[PDB]
Amino acid sequence: PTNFTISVTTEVMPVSMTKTSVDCTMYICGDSVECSTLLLQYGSFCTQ
């Protein structure tokens, strides 16, 4: 080569995504106390 080109190029890399949290009783049962009572057998799964 007898010449050169100074090249600037971009590289887009994801780093983080959206941090999310889930309230199980509001999703599964909403505001009903009967479903909230029945959901007490599934608390370990929601903690997981």
Ligand X SMILES: *[C@@H]1O[C@H](CO)[C@@H](O)[C@H](O)[C@H]1NC(C)=O
Using the Cα atoms of residue 27, residue 28, residue 32 and residue 37 in order, give the sign of their dihedral: negative
47 touches, from other proteins, ligand X, none (C-beta below 5 to 8 Å by class): none
3 touches, from other proteins, ligand X, none (C-beta below 5 to 8 Å by class): ligand X
Segment contacting other proteins (CB under 8 A): 4-12, 23-31, 40-48?
23-31
Q: Which is nearer to ligand X, 3 or 21 (CB)?
A: 3
Site for ligand X in 2-41 (CB under 6 A): 2-3
Distance (Å) of CA 33 to CA 3, 5, 16, 37: 77, 70, 37, 6
What is the amino acid identity at position 20? T
